[PDB]
Amino acid sequence: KLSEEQQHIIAILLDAHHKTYDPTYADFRDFRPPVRPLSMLPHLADLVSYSIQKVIGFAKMIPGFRDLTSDDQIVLLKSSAIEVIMLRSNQSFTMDDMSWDCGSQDYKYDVTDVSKAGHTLELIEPLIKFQVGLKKLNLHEEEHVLLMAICIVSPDRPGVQDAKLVEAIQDRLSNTLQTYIRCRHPPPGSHQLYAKMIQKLADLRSLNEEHSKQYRSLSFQPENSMKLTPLVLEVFGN
């Protein structure tokens, strides 16, 4: 049932993720140092800016993504970047203390680090719930990279021009994920697994909207915008 075109898609996405995710987190030393009001904003701005670069590298390798116009590629990455960052951040998230552990203690982040960057509980608590619920899904890496790709190529993102071409690319990844779960994910973990993953995509839209609200409020202060990066200002807005 899992066609070889579908196995091929999964292998490309696996290779793309492994090429764009460094579990050593060695590049974190080039960021501005973590400082523990808004003391974590410079470090977290560099972290997001770095992650945006990785999401772009991953997205470029999604089968069919390049067939979109540069405009459609830009609006999809602009809209999806923070959601893909939320998804890929789950690999470092640990449920033993509800934190993102990236090796050393300096690069072990909790909720107080998010608040020390300007963000409130309106985002922080739904974000932790999302990370816990995503972790509880116990996704195969095949399902994890498929979910990130499906997230990016969504035809209902604002500013999308060729929605039907975006929909065709997503449908090929969607049928690949649906078929993968039925053939390669054994019960009971497979139970309604596709439905639970699509629900996480809905949660990501909600988390995206709340982060945009707080980002727009935080970046409205030039004193805060000064500590951001040029890439973050371009992608997330001025």
Binding site: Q53, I56, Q73, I74, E234
Partner: peptide, 11 residues
């Protein structure tokens, strides 16, 4: 609006 840094990373 133009996104030159995004466009460059998209190579």
């Amino acid at each position: 609006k133009n996104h030159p840094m995004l466009m460059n990373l998209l190579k």
